[PDB]
């Protein structure tokens, strides 16, 4: 046997990450790198074909990172925001 020489995931079990739930394109990013966020707060607007999931806030804290810019393509189970 010889070898012929020719995007980050997320977690859906323990820690409070935000994984993509419908695969599509990112339309708007509202939350920056260092910014305070409260309950239910919209963070990320992503769009499919006839679908629109505006991502809310499950907890109440400070943003660690943003994993998508403007117009970036996402799959199901992809890291977007990680939160404590």
């Amino acid at each position: 046997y010889i070898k012929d020489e020719n995007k980050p995931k997320a977690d859906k079990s323990n820690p409070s990450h935000i994984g993509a739930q419908m695969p599509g394109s990112v339309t708007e990013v509202k939350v920056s790198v260092g910014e305070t966020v409260k309950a239910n707060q919209p963070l990320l607007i992503t769009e499919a074909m006839k679908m629109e999931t505006t991502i809310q806030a499950p907890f109440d804290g400070v943003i660690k990172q943003v994993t998508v810019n403007n117009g970036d393509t996402i799959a199901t189970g992809d890291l977007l925001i990680e939160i404590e």
């Binding site: 419908m22 695969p23 074909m49 679908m51 505006t54």
Partner: protein
């Protein structure tokens, strides 16, 4: 017309015409003319093959999942786009479940599109009915499905379960009246 009839569409006019031969009432139209149309649309349809649904046969299981015949090919393209081509039998199954989850509602546009979106979403994430019964999991539900529990599409006869609805919208909640009598008129002049 014959070649644009059947399955998820409506009955053939050409077929119905002959079906009434002998019976008291006849169909008022042109036989030979519809035949002529059928042959034309038979060829024209050939242009649109890429959009043909995955039904080639009558399905009696539609009596189970009550999916609108207009939504069908539209929703197939939606599942195809969302990485759910091949997995469309499971989308039909969930559609049935999404209905009894909402207290047995009427499924047409856009209420069909809500069940339609709730079905596509829950399959995508391997969710089920008890995934939100004692759970009530925050999940980032699609536009249409939260919109429906706000009442943006009206009120269903049996309503929604008080506790069911709640955990789907925590925060700015439900509105009671027909949307029109608070939603203020659009200024068409500023649009011009």
């Amino acid at each position: 017309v014959a070649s644009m009839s059947g399955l998820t569409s409506q009955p053939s006019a050409n077929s119905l015409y002959y079906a009434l031969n002998g019976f008291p009432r006849h169909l008022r139209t042109d036989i030979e003319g519809m035949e002529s149309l059928s042959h034309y649309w038979s060829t024209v349809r050939t242009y649109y093959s890429d959009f043909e649904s995955d039904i080639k046969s009558p399905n009696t299981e539609i009596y189970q999942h009550e999916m609108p015949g207009g939504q069908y090919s539209n929703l197939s393209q939606q599942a195809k786009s969302l990485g759910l081509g091949e997995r469309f039998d499971e989308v039909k199954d969930m559609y049935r479940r999404v209905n009894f989850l909402f207290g047995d509602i009427v499924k047409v546009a856009p209420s069909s599109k809500v069940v339609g979106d709730m079905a596509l979403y829950m399959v995508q994430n391997d969710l089920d009915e008890q995934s939100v019964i004692t759970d009530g999991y925050k999940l980032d539900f699609p536009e249409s499905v939260v919109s429906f529990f706000k009442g943006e599409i009206g009120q269903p006869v049996n309503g929604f379960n008080k506790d069911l609805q709640a955990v789907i919208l925590k925060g700015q909640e439900a509105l009671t009246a027909r949307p029109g009598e608070y939603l203020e008129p659009v200024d068409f002049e500023k649009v011009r």
